[PDB]
Every structure is written in C-alpha cells, then in structure tokens.
Amino acid sequence: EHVNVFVANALVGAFLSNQAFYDLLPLLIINDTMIGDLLGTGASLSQFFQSHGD
Amino acid sequence: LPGPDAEKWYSIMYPTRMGTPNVSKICNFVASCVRNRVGRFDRAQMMNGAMSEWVDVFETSDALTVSIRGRWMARLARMNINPTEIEWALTECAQGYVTVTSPYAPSVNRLMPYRISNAERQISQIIRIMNIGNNATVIQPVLQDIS
Amino acid sequence: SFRVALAGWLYNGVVTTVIDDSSYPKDGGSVTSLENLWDFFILALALPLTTDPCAPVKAFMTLANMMVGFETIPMDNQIYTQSRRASAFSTPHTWPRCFMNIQLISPIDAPILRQWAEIIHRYWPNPSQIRYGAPNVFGSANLFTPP
Amino acid sequence: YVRLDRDRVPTMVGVTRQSRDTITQPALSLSTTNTTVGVPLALDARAIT
Amino acid sequence: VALLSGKYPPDLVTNVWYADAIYPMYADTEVFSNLQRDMITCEAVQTLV
Amino acid sequence: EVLLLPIDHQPANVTTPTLDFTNELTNWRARVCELMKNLVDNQRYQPGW
Amino acid sequence: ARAAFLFKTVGFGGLQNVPINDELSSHLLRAGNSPWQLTQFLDWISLGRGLATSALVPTAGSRYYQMSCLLSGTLQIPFRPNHRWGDIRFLRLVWSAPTLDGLVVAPPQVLAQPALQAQADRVYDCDDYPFLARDPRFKHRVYQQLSAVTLLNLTGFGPISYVRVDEDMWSGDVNQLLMNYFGHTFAEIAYTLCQASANRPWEHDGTYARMTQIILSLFWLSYVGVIHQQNTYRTFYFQCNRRGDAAEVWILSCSLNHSAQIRPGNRSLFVMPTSPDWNMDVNLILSSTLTGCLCSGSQLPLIDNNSVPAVSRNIHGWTGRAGNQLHGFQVRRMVTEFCDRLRRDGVMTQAQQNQIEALADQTQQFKRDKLEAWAREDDQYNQANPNSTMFRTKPFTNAQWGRGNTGATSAAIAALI
Amino acid sequence: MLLEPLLSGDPRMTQLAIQYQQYNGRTFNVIPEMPGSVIADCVQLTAEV
Hints:
The structure is cut from a larger assembly and holds one copy of chain A, six copies of chain B and one copy of chain G.
Chain A: H1 5-15, H2 36-40
Chain B: H1 9-12, H2 25-31, E1 39-43, E2 55-58, H3 63-79, H4 83-93, H5 118-130, H6 136-146
Antiparallel strand pairs in B: 1-2
Chain G: E1 6-8, H1 22-28, H2 38-44, H3 60-74, E2 93-95, E3 103-105, H4 108-112, E4 123-125, H5 130-133, H6 136-153, E5 161-166, H7 172-178, H8 186-199, H9 207-223, E6 236-240, E7 250-254, E8 266-273, H10 282-297, E9 303-304, E10 319-320, E11 326-329, H11 331-345, H12 350-384, H13 406-414
Parallel strand pairs in G: 8-11, 9-10
Antiparallel strand pairs in G: 1-4, 2-3, 5-8, 6-7
Helix pairs in contact in G: 6-10, 7-9, 8-10, 9-10, 11-12
C-alpha cells in the first residue's frame, strides 16, 4: 500500500518529541490524494500542517 | 406635486395642455407643439400593488440641473450593494463565529450606497494618518478603546 | 403546535410551517453539553412534521454544528463554514454538496455525521397520497394536484 | 412534497392576470415576496415531540 | 503578571463562547457609515484641485 | 486582507482547551528561568549565598 | 484561466499621430487625473438614462474611443524596451509614478524637449513591464480595462461581446445572488459588477465570473427575441418597454408562465455591432465592458484570424489560427429580427411591430445625421489645425451602415439554446 | 368578498391563472378553462339591442 509521506514524517516527528501521535495513524495510508486527504482533517498539530482552503 | 396650493403647478408643469383660442404669442407657441409628449412616459411596475420602481415623465425642468442630478444618481448607483453581498461580507469577517441572513425573493429595489474603491479608502487612510503623526495623545485613546 | 402542524398539511401552498428558531441549541450548541444533546433529540424527532421543505438539511446541519471541534465535514463554499447556524438553511440553494453526496463525508474525519447523514437519506419519511371528497357531484378545487 | 429531491423543491407561487399571448408589465403577485413557498408559521419542537 | 497568571473558564468551549461574545459587536453598522464618509473626503479633495 | 503579527500563530484544532506548554512564549519563560538557574549554580557566584 | 496578458493599442485613422490632442485629454482628466477611466466613464454616461452629449465628447461611444487613445498613447512610454517611465512626455503629459497611477503636466525641462512619437496598432505584453508583472492584483485590476480597450481596437467596428450558454454554470450561490437584481436595469447591474470586479478581481470559475456571464447571455438572448415574458430562461429574461427608442432601457425581470427547455452542453460565440449607431447605445457598450472584466481571470476562446484585420492577428491571448468567428450586425435590422421572432411566437401583433419599426427608423435617421455631421466637423478641424489632428469619435465608413450578416448572426445566437 | 382582491392594481385583465416553480427553474402553469357566463352574455345581448 502507498503511504502518505507528509503524515509519515509528522508521525515520527511527533512521537520523537512526545506529542500526541496516535490520531495520525488512520491517515498513514493514502486514501486518494496525498494532499487532498489532509486538506480536510482536524487532527494533530497545526505545528505540522494546517489548511487554507485548497 | 405634494403640498397645498398645488393647482397652480399643473399649468407651469405642462404647457402643451393649455387651450389655444387666441393668436397670442403664447398660444402660437403652445399651438405648435407636439401633443403626445406630456405626462407619464414609461414605467417599471414590478410588484402588483406596490409602487413603480421608477418612472420617466415629461414636464418642465432644465437640461442642466437634470444632467447634474443624473450623474449624481449615477455615482450612487455604483456604490449600491445588495443583502446577499452584505451577508457574505459580514459572514466572512466574523470568521464563522457569527451567522447572518438575507432573504431569497423578489425585492422592491433598494438603494444602499456603501461600496467604494480601494483607492478611495487608501486616500482617506492617509489623510487619517496625517493629522495624528507625532501626537501620542491622539492615538492612545484609540488603543484604549480596542483594549 | 401538534394539531396545527397537521392542519398545515392542507394549505401547504400558502402557509409553510417550520420550527421556531428558539428550539435550536443556544449559540449553536456542542456535543459536549448534556442539555444540548437533548435539544438535538427533541428537534430531530419533531422536524418531520413540518411542511418546511428544508427540514432534512436542518436536521443534519444541527448536529454538524454541535460537532465543531470533534468531527469535520467539507464545505463547498469558501464563505460559509461548518458553523453556519442550522436554522439558516431555509432555501434549497443552501443544501451543502456533502449532504446530497454522502460519499463526500469521511468516515475517518467525521464518523458520526456520516451515519446521521445516511440515516436521514435512508429513513426520513416518504410522502404519499389519499383519495378524498366526491369529485363527481361536488367537483374539486384542487389546482396543482389531481381532483 | 418531495423529500430529498432538491431540484424538485417548490419555491414560489404566483398568480397572473393577462393571457399567454401578451407581453405586459410583469406584476408579480405579493404571494411571491415570501422567502418560503408560503407565509412562515413557527411551531414548537418541544410540544410536538 | 499577565503572562504569568492567565486562566480559562472551567468548562470553556471556544466554538460557543465566541458565538456569544461577538454577536453584539456585529450589530454595529458604524462600519458602513464610515465608508460613505471616505467617499466624500475624496470628492472634497479633487473638487479642490 | 493581511494582518501581520509579531508572534507565531498556530491555529488551535480543538474547542475544548487544556493546559499546553508547547507554545512559543512558554519556551521563552523556560529558557529565561534555566538561564537564571545557571547564573546561580555558577561555580564562581554560588559561593556567595 | 488566462496566462497571457497582452493588449492592442488603437491605430491612426490615416493620421500622423494618435487621434487625440491636449484639448481632448485635459477634458478627460478634467475631474479625475487617472487614465484608467472606467469609473469616471460610468459617471458621465449616466446610467444611460438619456442621450449623453458634450462639446468635445458628443456620444458615449466617443468617450469610450477617446479613453482608448489616451491609453494607447501614454502607455507606449513605459512599454519602451528600456522601460523608463518619467523621462519623456506625450503631449505635455507624463506619468505620476512607475505604478502608472496618473498623468500630470510635464516639468519644464521635459516640456522643453520633444515628445514621444507614438506608433499605431501596437501589441504589448504586460508581463514585460516589471511593476505590472510583480504585483499580480495590480495587473488584474488594470487588465480588466486594457481588455475592454482591445475588444474595441481589434476591428474597425464596434465593441465585441462574449455570449455563452451552459446549464452547468447555474450553481447554488449563483442562483442566490442573481435574484437580487430583479428590477434593476442592465446598466444599474453592470455598474455594480464593474466596481465589485475592480475591488476583488474575479477567479476563473468564480461566483461573480459566472453570474456576469449569465447576465450577458440573458441580455442578448432577449435583445434578439429568443426569450421573453412567455418563454423564459429559468424564469429570467430582460424586458424593454420601448424597443427601438434612441436610449433603450432594459430591465431584468421574472415570469413563471414558461421556461424554455435548454439543450445540455456548453456553447458560446462573439457578437459585435457593425453599424456606427453603436456610439449611442449604452447597453451594447457596457456589454463589452463586462466581457472585458471577464478576461482578467478567464481565457476566452480564440478569435479566428480571418475575422479580423491583418494588423491584429495571431495575438497570443486573443486572435488565433483556427478560432471562432465574429458575428456582426446592424442595429436597425436586428430590431426587426427581434419583432419578427416575437410575432412568430404569437406575443406581438403586426400593428405593434409596425409601431416599433416606425420609431426604430426615426431613431436611426437621427443618430446617423448627427454622427456624419460631427464626423465632418472633425475633418474641418483637422485641415485647419494640422499639428493637433484628432477624432472625437471612432472613424466609420458609408459602408458600415448596411445590413450584412445581421440576420445570419441573429440566428446564430438563437442557436445557443 | 367577491372580486375585491382583483381590484388591487390594474384590473384591466384578460384571464386568471396560477403557478409555482421548482429550484431547477422549471415551472407549472395552471390555466382554468373558463366556460360561459349568463350574466356576461345577457349584458352583451341587451347591449346589442
């Protein structure tokens, strides 16, 4: 299966700094678009990524 | 026309209405005018049982001041915005926390002049800044307010 | 309210019944407040009896509102948010895209709302008709429907 | 009454006085100035439930 | 002292709190009025020159 | 539409806050303290207290 | 989604310089000092609620032209290969700043030296000038106008307009917004759209961008008589109580009586009046102006080189090798096409038609006598003042007055449905 | 009542009809087939005389 690099990176990156990381797993595998997938979500920190519409 | 003592106007208003029994300098003029250009000329009736949105009509007046008022209305007509535009605008500013509403149906034409060009806003924002620069006691109360 | 609600079914062409804005959750509500959850209940359970053609959409959005900060649905408009009060979706042009196409709601990003959506589509009442009167002797003043 | 069939939702009811073979001043019936299809009547969710 | 002793209400819920706090502020159309002023301020200037 | 800020703004993703130290200014407090603490445990300053 | 920003300056009517002089410019800049006259134009024109006229500007179509010349001139300064902006004048005028925010009288030391020798029919690319390429917004706001200009300068005829029909455009937000315009005139609407456009330039398939496109179709589809109170487009249609009159006034209105069934798909074409009497038809003009605002963010279909003059062919963003053709028409004749059509649907009587046609005749008669007369006045001036030659109105020829394709395009439009 | 409602604006009419529209723009027009009228005819008969 294809993994979402963005998420992968934040995962490791959150875990290595003791930040909540479990809510990221369900996004580890890409659904349809590596970007589109995250554009919605209200998960994890805005420290890793936030959305501005498109 | 409104107001009492109005019967007078109906004769200064429409010259083509007078009778022409004389050979008087006046009658001669009147007599030579086209009959059909008097009174209401055309209108925009949108709601059955409401006022006409506007009407064009023949009657005494002067081309000059008519033109002046014409461009005046023209300028305001450009500043007009409608409920929906306002709904959107306000909604956008509040970032979602507040929600307002506009109706969806045939209106009766409303003149609400408020939209101006960015240019116009900058120009006044400069004037604004101008008369304050260096004088603290002018800007402080502004901050306290926001405070 | 109960009885009138029924009487309304008869003159659905000149009068449209709806739930008083006051019956919705104060300030939008939140799935974290016990009181609000009850508001939701009471609401959802009663909407179906109103002639308001937008009941469904409102029944949906209400929960979507309370869900802010827990689940998220996608908005088609860059203006309206997921917090647009429910009682505001009064006309058809406001039905959100993700409401007509459930497929757009992520079971990951908004698991509950997704069900609420399916439940509405799959279980909201289905209209029907019944014969009435004696059309051969009394005739019938029906206009948009068969006699 | 149409449930979720959006396109078919009614939104306006009007009356006409002139015949189909004429072009007159459009004078929409007041009936059409309602946001809804008809005059809004508000009911109490509590009671009904 | 501010940076050292900030505190949020017990059961705070941003999405609600703000919905109440801001509403009244957005019932003050003073904003729109101001636009009309700016509009003139500029007419005045050019009229001068 | 741009509004500049002399601080880093990271929008919150929740509506039910909880104490959080993962802030720009929280570290600042931390560092400042850690510095002081070091000034005190400084081998050539600590003997005077 | 437009990516190439080019425009075309106007050409000399067989003159040795751009058809505009100091006396005329001073008149344009009378109350405003900027060359981007959209706003200032919309004021003079006065909601096209009566024939507008002046001493130096006899018709709306005149001011539209003149406005074009002024830009065609001044703009050749900053668009020189070196891109210098305030080192030379153009008839005593020089730019206020690199950001082309206005023109002012030249400093003495600049008045002393010679002026710029402008050329005709030039095509430029905005992105070649730094200050335009670096501030996109600025570009888009201004392009809106350069386009309206180009749309007037492509051919020796009137202002081009873009008519499109596509049920897919009708979305939620669109429907919501449109309904507000019920009762306003074509002008009254255009006026606002223009302003709203200048403040926040439209997107490719934006809410405004679409509605404005829809309005245009609604206007035209009605101007020709394909739609009316008894055969509407989703209940909408423009109404005109005095078709034919010198100053027409169209009103957007509603009707539930019937809503013509529309064919799915996307269809569009270009129209343009060919008869000189356009210089006196506010709607026909504003219509272009709007399709003008459209161009800032959207890339319209290309125009077939064979429909335009040599000089204006293969213009990267406008004219192409295998594009759509321009459909021209005589104003007067269309009036009949309008009537004939309605009468065939059975909504207008023969008597009514006669009554209209009659007026429509009297109108043309007037508009022509005047245009020709002012035209003469111009030459009379040019012979006496060879150093300040000009034209108060875009040049036209006796031929322009004929029918030609009027009927052909009358049906072309009717085919959009 | 009787005709009152028709006298609220340009009663110079031809024929009554009522309709409603759907969100998708389609509309339904109902135009009742008016039959004869003794009163109407009689007026005309006597008028002919």
